[PDB]
């Protein structure tokens, strides 16, 4: 079921300064009193993070892009925030990641979900007894084709007043969804607190899906004075959540006698910080130093190739009715075209595709100076003789490639058309 909570308009996004918060452990290795340098997707220190709230009486939980990674945070004594949804279209055309947390368990499902315009979790309280809580999921309209399902113990959640900050870095590398988190008390501060907190790995989900956008899920207590369908009646406490964006950066990390991260230095943040990266020590003495220059990061990629829109007059060399004999092999010049191998792969399946000097992948990116295709017909056991350095009848007496050959060899079966009965 869905309730169209409607924000008459989105309030202008509020920017708050992240205070050097959010550095996760790179790997599960015990390192003690050793400074370790790693280059990973990282939240830049002092970034402009979001200040999105929950109730002002708008219920604003808009979708935000997931470019590389999201540093999330939450500051409420009552657990208003529970889980997140990750996806690229969020309309049941692609595979989306569902994270939802109820009092007993945490359910992670990768399915084709038709998410509602304003999803939330419904908490219903029996009158005169808050103890009786019944929960109805108002996030997904339907689910289909679930690949990965995961159920486990609930993430630490609140059940001497204190506010518990929960920070969750989400990363999608090589089809792995890495989540790092750590909960700390909050005392006498209204915004993201100072100091250093290191996030420890919790799960490593092999979701293997495309993620482009994400949205925050809120658990709203139900008020029965006004009807459920209307935005009114879903009142909850005032909770503000932070969203940051991860950009690739190189951060030195400082461990301690016991093996926990205490301090970090980002080379990009300060010229002094860059000096620390070169010396490989947090302490720097008085003087002048020369540092390695890697403060510049690429921002765009430009591609320039000459004007040739013509598909190659291959002459259907691959599809040619008659090929050359091996004693007189035909060589054909290729000039003034744009070589596309995608059509050739669709046209026929090649049994042998061995390229030397140029990799088979990213070969379509590269320009080739001059192409002389040499074509012939042999038998199967002699195909290995085509490769340079190996000998045989064909290699010694019929056709020889040099040791420094840079090119490709493409061999495919032809028993259907090149074999005659009798």
């Amino acid at each position, epitope marked *: 079921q869905c309730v169209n909570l409607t924000t008459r308009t989105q309030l202008p996004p509020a920017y708050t300064n992240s205070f050097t918060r959010g550095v996760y452990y790179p790997d599960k290795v015990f390192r003690s009193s050793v400074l370790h340098s790693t280059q990973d997707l990282f939240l830049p220190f002092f970034s402009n993070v979001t200040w999105f709230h929950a109730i002002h009486k708008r219920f604003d939980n808009p979708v935000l892009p997931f470019n590389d990674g999201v540093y999330f945070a939450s500051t409420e004594k009552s657990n208003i925030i529970r889980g997140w949804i990750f996806g690229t279209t969020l309309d049941s055309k692609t595979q989306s990641l569902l994270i939802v947390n109820n009092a007993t368990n945490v359910v992670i499902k990768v399915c084709e979900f038709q998410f509602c315009n304003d999803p939330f979790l419904g908490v219903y309280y029996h*009158k005169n007894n808050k103890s009786w809580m019944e929960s109805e999921f108002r996030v997904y309209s339907s689910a289909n084709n679930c690949t990965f399902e995961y159920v486990s113990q609930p993430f630490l959640m609140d059940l001497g007043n204190f506010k518990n900050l929960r920070e969750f870095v989400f990363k999608n590398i090589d089809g792995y969804f890495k989540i790092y988190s750590k909960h700390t008390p909050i005392n006498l501060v209204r915004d993201l607190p100072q100091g250093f907190s290191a996030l420890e790995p919790l799960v490593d989900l092999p979701i293997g899906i495309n993620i482009t956008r994400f949205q925050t899920l809120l658990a709203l207590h139900r008020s029965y004075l006004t009807p*459920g369908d209307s935005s009114s009646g879903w009142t909850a406490g005032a909770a503000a959540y932070y969203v940051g964006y991860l950009q690739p950066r190189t951060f030195l990390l400082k461990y301690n006698e016991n093996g926990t991260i205490t301090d970090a230095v980002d080379c990009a943040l300060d010229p002094l910080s860059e000096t620390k990266c070169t010396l490989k020590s947090f302490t720097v003495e008085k003087g002048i130093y020369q540092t390695s220059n890697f403060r510049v990061q690429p921002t765009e990629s430009i591609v320039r190739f000459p004007n040739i829109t013509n598909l190659c007059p291959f002459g259907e060399v691959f599809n040619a009715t008659r090929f050359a004999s091996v004693y007189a092999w035909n060589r054909k010049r290729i000039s003034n075209c744009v070589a596309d191998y995608s059509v050739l792969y669709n046209s026929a399946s090649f049994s042998t595709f061995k390229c030397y000097g140029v990799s088979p992948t990213k070969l379509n990116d590269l320009c080739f100076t001059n192409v002389y295709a040499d074509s012939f017909v042999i038998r199967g056991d002699e195909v290995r003789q085509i490769a340079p350095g190996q000998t045989g009848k064909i290699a010694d007496y019929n056709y020889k490639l040099p040791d420094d050959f840079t090119g490709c060899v493409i061999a495919w079966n032809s028993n259907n058309l090149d074999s005659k009965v009798g």
Partner: antibody
Amino acid sequence: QVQLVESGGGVVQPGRSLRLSCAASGLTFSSYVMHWVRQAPGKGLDWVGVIWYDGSKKYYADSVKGRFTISRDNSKNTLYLQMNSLRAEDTAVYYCARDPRDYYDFWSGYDYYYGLDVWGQGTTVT
Amino acid sequence: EIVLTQSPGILSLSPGERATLSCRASQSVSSSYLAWYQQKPGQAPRLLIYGASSRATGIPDRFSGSGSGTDFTLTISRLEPEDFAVYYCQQYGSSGALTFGGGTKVEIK
């Protein structure tokens, strides 16, 4: 944009059968208690019946007895109603209306009644 | 099957004036069962007030309602030209029967 579509109208031969059905746009049709209101030509509104979220409890008004049956189809997004007879009550306009009181609202100890929020287009029953 | 009574049946007032409406119930009501409606001729009724002294979504602040026990009142602050129609009151309980009122009418003068 919520819209309930009436159907099965028109003047027929009086008695023994007539078909009414009410559709509902969107996917919020199920789990909302629904009622049927008949509009007399000159005598105001009246009641037909009520069905819950799952149809376990059903109740009918005292104006008519033993002639009306109410059922909901979840997949077709259409609620179905049948009259086993056609009495002298003619030219009555029948509306279908959705009441937001969901199962959870009466599940909670609170005793509350909301209002019939959205109504249908209407139809002619003779 | 509760005997509801609306008085007066017909009201004639100029636009911009104040009109009061009555809907009396023959039995005791827990002050959370009544609803108020406006019905223009030829169209479906529209929700105005649900429960007691609670305004529905989209209803302007000009419309008001009050009442408890067996006496209930609808009071309008100012009569718009589009607010001139017939009004009905009902009362419903989970096992209770649903009974609309005979109806009242406001008219131009």
